[PDB]
């Protein structure tokens, strides 16, 4: 190939890895975990895709399932989902967690899909459902298996068609940042923890903002990603030659030509800064990074 | 699926309660339950809830540090205790379980979030 290269835009125009959102942050946070096992936004500098990371954003936070729906007195309306990928093709358990850019976050997901009825003078419109993600449920939820659940409540039978639906993200409730039950409490293939990092580096997060049910608190739900998916697309696209471990970038402002700071992206396709500190550090995120030369995996970075 | 709460009383400002939340033809020890109150004549609201799994508790912030919830799986039942009590803790104090599809680590702290529900039990502050 040539040189390894990046897209030139800058971090706030680019779209986040793990929820379909803008990114709209850039920081280190030595006090949340190092190595997070996010199984979205995972791509190698050689274009190797990992986990359930999916090529187009549009897929992030999303699946695609045959819809059976169901009314029950005490439930209400019921949705059994027979996962599919999201470009129409047959799901079949493999070498991930899940169809590609199924979640790979914890708590309950307002989710809205395509309805059909068969009621007088209605037959489509969008209806949205609760979804629990995780990390545990007392849904058995198996995306792995390609079957996870969904439910509304309802005084009366919603009297709703089966047919295909492409599930997109409402909200979330409760939010945690661990992976979500993909084969009902067993294990299934993941994409390694994130690093390894030299002692002193840290992770550089894209952070975007989730959508949220909370009946007390207005702060915003954070949620950060390795690499915005213009970058994920970007080494997909281009199956580079890799040589070391590592690439030295260095973050600048384009119209100034002032250093933020300089930065190793490894191969294994996550950023580290060299920051001594204890609490979170943000960056201006009109900057463009740059790739300088390849460097040893040892590589001391200068510190933030 | 049944529940049924005693405790509580009448009492002056800086006394404690314990409510009871006692559950029948089911086990809660893997349900999310929530404890609300009700003045006759304002809205049911949100005082505290344990998840599913029971590692996870969440308090209005006026009650944070003064009430405590609990679940006791081989008793089956939840308590609320309510220590240095004040007038505006004066109301009715309902349990509930939600027993549809949950995230076992999510207190949940809505109304619409839970199905069965206690006949209450009242605490009144002088």
């Known amino acids: 190939s040539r040189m390894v290269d990046l897209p030139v835009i800058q971090p706030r125009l680019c779209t986040h890895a793990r929820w379909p959102a803008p990114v709209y942050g850039l920081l280190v946070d030595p006090s949340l975990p190092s190595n997070p096992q996010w199984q979205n936004g995972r791509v190698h500098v050689d274009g190797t895709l990992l986990g359930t990371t999916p090529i187009s954003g549009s897929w992030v936070s999303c699946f695609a399932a045959e819809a059976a729906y169901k009314f029950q007195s005490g439930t209400g309306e019921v949705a059994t989902f027979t996962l599919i990928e999201q470009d129409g093709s047959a799901y079949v358990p493999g070498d991930r967690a899940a169809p590609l850019g199924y979640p790979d976050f914890s708590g309950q997901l307002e989710i809205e899909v395509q309805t059909e009825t068969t009621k007088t003078g209605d037959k489509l419109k969008v209806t949205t459902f609760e979804m629990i993600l995780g990390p545990t449920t007392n849904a058995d939820q198996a995306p792995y298996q390609g079957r996870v659940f969904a439910s509304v409540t309802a005084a009366a039978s919603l009297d709703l068609v089966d047919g295909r639906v492409r599930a997109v993200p409402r909200s979330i409730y409760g939010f945690q940042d661990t992976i979500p039950e993909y084969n009902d409490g067993l294990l299934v293939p993941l994409a390694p923890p994130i690093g390894p990092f030299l002692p002193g580096e840290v992770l550089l997060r894209f952070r975007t903002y989730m959508r949220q049910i909370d009946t007390a608190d207005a702060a915003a739900e954070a949620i950060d990603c390795a690499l915005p998916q213009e970058f994920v697309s970007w080494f997909a696209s281009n199956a580079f030659t890799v040589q070391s471990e590592a690439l030295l970038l260095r973050y600048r402002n384009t119209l100034t030509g002032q250093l933020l700071f300089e930065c190793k992206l490894y191969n294994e396709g996550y950023i580290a800064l060299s920051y001594s500190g204890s609490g979170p550090l943000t960056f201006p995120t009109d900057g463009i990074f740059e790739v300088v030369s390849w460097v040893p995996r040892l590589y001391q970075l200068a510190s933030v | 699926v049944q529940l049924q709460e005693s405790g509580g009383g009448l009492v002056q400002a800086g006394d404690s309660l314990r409510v009871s939340c006692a559950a029948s033809?089911?086990?809660?020890?893997?349900?999310?339950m929530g404890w609300f109150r009700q003045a006759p004549g304002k809205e049911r609201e949100f005082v505290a809830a344990?998840?599913?799994?029971?590692?996870?508790?969440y308090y209005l912030d006026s009650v944070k540090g003064r009430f405590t919830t609990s679940r006791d799986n081989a008793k089956n039942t939840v308590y609320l205790q309510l220590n240095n009590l004040k007038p505006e803790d004066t109301a009715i104090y309902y349990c509930?379980?939600?027993?549809?599809?949950?995230?076992?680590?999510?207190?949940?702290?809505?109304?619409?979030?839970?199905?069965?529900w206690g006949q209450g039990t009242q605490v009144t502050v002088s």
């Open positions: 033809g089911r086990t809660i020890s893997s349900s999310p």
């Open positions: 344990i998840s599913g799994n029971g590692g996870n508790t």
């Open positions: 509930a379980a939600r027993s549809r599809f949950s995230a076992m680590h999510l207190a949940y702290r809505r109304l619409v979030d839970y199905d069965d």
